[PDB]
Nucleic acid binder design. Structure first.
Ligand SMILES: [Mg+2]
Ligand SMILES: [Mg+2]
Ligand code: NA
Ligand code: NA
Length: 331
DNA sequence: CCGACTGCGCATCAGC
DNA sequence: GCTGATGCGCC
DNA sequence: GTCGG
């Protein structure tokens, strides 16, 4: 379980708003993560915070945030935030960043030029790049969650088509979906083939062929980016006669070397906390884990050649550990 | 006091 | 024309 | 903004 929004939702929301403002307007990504961290640890606190000093005891909450909590608890609001919400420039910039492709920098230019709304964007399509236009075109669709049943139907199509292109491909839908989530933000598909390894051929056709098949059967509808290794785009479940159309969805497809496949699966399955905690634990046992490989340290810190991996279990075993089921990888 | 806070693929810019 | 930087989305 | 060298 988890503490209800009722407990410290006002505080966590306040911290999340300030988090967004720092990243989108101040362009202070570290202060953005500082705030989110503070919001997380408070969202876990199973007690109604009575003072900023009480919250200060938590890892991620320092003096500044303690002061803000005191102001919020005593008044019900934060002056600095109340002033940011009313600022036309800060609000507009903040808003435009909700478009995929528009970050802090682009949002800034648009607002400096008067472009402050989606409507303003439509009248200025020539000023947008390919990514941004897709983000615009699907603004609303991209903010909708993906229920597990739809992800299942999406997986059906992906696994079916990949196998159809070459039955030797190995495909694994990762992300929260693999962790048994009831809903998802997007679909992350990891791909490999026996003919693709670190020391072999780079083959631009392996990822290209699969994307093509999914476009042939009308599953993939748009392309944000696509190289020889990574593909980012859009997909949509086919419409049932008479029933309403499905929302367009974000889908990523990655071609990974077979010898780095399982480290990739584990990584893109998350959770980020589970990854951080698993990396932190991996440190104690004298190992370093990333998206690509697992390497042995030699006391000074000399990481030798990447250890052989043939399954996710192999990784868990290496670090003296039992394989954690994806559904439990929450923390 | 003061540096770390992950680092990379792909698209697009800035400059030679 | 190229190479390197920057912006962006992401555990 | 917070933590830790
Ligand atoms: Mg700034
Ligand atoms: Mg993801
Ligand atoms: Na603290
Ligand atoms: Na954005």
């Amino acid at each position: 379980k988890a503490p209800q929004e009722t407990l410290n939702g006002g505080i966590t929301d306040m911290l999340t708003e300030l988090a967004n403002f720092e990243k989108n307007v101040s362009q202070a990504i570290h202060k953005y993560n500082a705030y989110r961290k503070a919001a997380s640890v408070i969202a876990k606190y199973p007690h109604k915070i009575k003072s900023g000093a009480e919250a200060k005891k938590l890892p991620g909450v320092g003096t500044k945030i303690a002061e803000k909590i005191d102001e919020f608890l005593a008044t019900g609001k934060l002056r600095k935030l109340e002033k940011i919400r009313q600022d036309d420039t800060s609000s507009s910039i903040n808003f435009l960043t909700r478009v995929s492709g528009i970050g802090p920098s682009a949002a800034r230019k648009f607002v400096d030029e008067g472009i402050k709304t989606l409507e303003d964007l439509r009248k200025n399509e020539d000023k947008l790049n390919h990514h941004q236009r897709i983000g615009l075109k699907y603004f609303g669709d991209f903010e909708k969650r993906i229920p597990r049943e739809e992800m299942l139907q999406m997986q059906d199509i992906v696994l079916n088509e990949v196998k159809k292109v070459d039955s030797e491909y190995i495909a694994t839908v990762c992300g929260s979906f693999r962790r048994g989530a009831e809903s998802s933000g997007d679909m992350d598909v990891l791909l490999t083939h026996p003919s693709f390894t670190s020391e072999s051929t780079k083959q631009p056709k392996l990822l290209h062929q699969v994307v093509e098949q999914l476009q042939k059967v009308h599953f993939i509808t748009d392309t944000l980016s696509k190289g020889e290794t990574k593909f980012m785009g859009v997909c949509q479940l086919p419409s049932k006669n008479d029933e309403k159309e499905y929302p367009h969805r974000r889908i990523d497809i990655r071609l990974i070397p077979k010898d780095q496949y399982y480290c990739g699966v584990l990584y893109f399955t998350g959770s980020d906390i589970f990854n951080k905690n698993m990396r932190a634990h991996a440190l104690e046992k004298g190992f370093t884990i990333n998206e690509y490989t697992i390497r042995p340290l030699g006391v000074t810190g000399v990481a030798g050649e990447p250890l052989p991996v043939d399954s996710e279990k192999d990784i868990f075993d290496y670090i003296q550990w039992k394989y954690r089921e994806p559904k439990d990888r929450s923390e």
